[PDB]
Amino acid sequence: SPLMGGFGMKHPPPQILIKNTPVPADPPTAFNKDKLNSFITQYSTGQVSVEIEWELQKENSKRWNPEIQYTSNYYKSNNVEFAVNTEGVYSEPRPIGTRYLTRNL
Amino acid sequence: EVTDNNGVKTIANNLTSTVQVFTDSDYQLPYVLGSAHEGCLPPFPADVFMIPQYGYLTLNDGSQAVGRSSFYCLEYFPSQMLRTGNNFQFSYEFENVPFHSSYAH
Secondary structure: OOOOOOOOOOOOOOOOOOOOOOOEOOOOOOOOOOOOOOEOOOOOOOOOOOOOOOOOOOOOOOOOOOOOOOOOOOOOOOOOOOOEOOOOOEOOOOOOOOOOOOOOO | OEEEEOOEEEEOOOOOOOEEEOOOOOOOOOOOOOOOOOOOOOOOOOOOOOOOOOOOOOOEEOOEEOOOOOOOOHHHOOOEEEOOOOOOOOOOOOOOOOOOOOOOO
């Protein structure tokens, strides 16, 4: 299991490598055997979509007590947590972990 | 039914009263077998034994409880009710355990 947390896999999701194909600017009219360092400056843009299916383990506790849950707070604030501000920059308030429910040992 | 009249114990049987039994088959109660407790079936078959009282410990902050401390009502489980004509049968298959090494090297 990775020490920073997560799922350790022998064969994780493969790396996806992407490159703009070099387009030479224009060769000299007489032949030259050197490797054509002059190129047309360009960049690419696009859309990428990732779809992951996750299997869940539903909590099945017989505990009578109400449990601890992650919640937002109902107190007036300048900004909404996990939103954008007046500038338009999105920010995340605190690091949310996954351990809120309980189980017996 | 035991009755105390002027410090005199008279034991009469109560044909209509019941006894509740259940097996925690889903393992959703604190498990107190496996702590080497002095309450077992006696080694000698001709002995009559008292049934030990069930109880459990949860998370403590010294003498105080914490939010994660769990309380179990055992009456929240489905039990079988028995009044003197009834019996209770339970079957269990042990999971695959290794043979205990009954030898020296």
